[PDB]
Amino acid sequence: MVDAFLGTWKLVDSKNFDDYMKSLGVGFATRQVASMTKPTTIIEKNGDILTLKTHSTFKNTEISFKLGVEFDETTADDRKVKSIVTLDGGKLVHLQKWDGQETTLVRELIDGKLILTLTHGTAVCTRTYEKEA
Numbered sequence: 001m002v003d004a005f006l007g008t009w010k011l012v013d014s015k016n017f018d019d020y021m022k023s024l025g026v027g028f029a030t031r032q033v034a035s036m037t038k039p040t041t042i043i044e045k046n047g048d049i050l051t052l053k054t055h056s057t058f059k060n061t062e063i064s065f066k067l068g069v070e071f072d073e074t075t076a077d078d079r080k081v082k083s084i085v086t087l088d089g090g091k092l093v094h095l096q097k098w099d100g101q102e103t104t105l106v107r108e109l110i111d112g113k114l115i116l117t118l119t120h121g122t123a124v125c126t127r128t129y130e131k132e133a
């Protein structure tokens with residue numbers, strides 16, 4: 001049941017995103033621009049196929065996936081990963097695997113805000129998105 005996540009969301013807070021990017025090996029110039037970027041995330045469904053768009057003035061991505069079915073993904077920072085997205089404890093959990101590394105991108109709804117928690121290595125980044133009408 002992912003319906004409450006659907007819609008258009010805009011970034012309104014970010015904590016520790018530089019640490020997360022640095023942990024992934026993102027270069028300093030990309031981190032600089034990324035630290036000042038406010039993406040718009042659009043989450044749509046057609047049956048159990050979700051499409052998650054992330055749009056910004058810097059990088060854009062789009063993925064489509066069936067919940068619970070692995071898919072290939074090429075991330076905004078150009079990692080080629082094996083991914084799966086599932087609903088777990090009411091949270092939309094996106095796991096990426098590559099070269100034996102793992103990162104999770106976890107989305108949950110708290111007081112009407114979408115909280116995205118990004119974990120890689122020890123780095124834990126929390127980004128907050130609010131719904132656009």
Ligand SMILES: CCCCCC/C=C/CCCCCCCCCC(=O)O
Binds near residue numbers: 054058061076
């Ligand atoms: C498409 C926009 C990507 C996030 C902002 C620009 C950063 C680019 C390089 C680092 C990418 C790291 C993995 C993706 C993080 C997504 C964050 C988010 O959706 O808020």
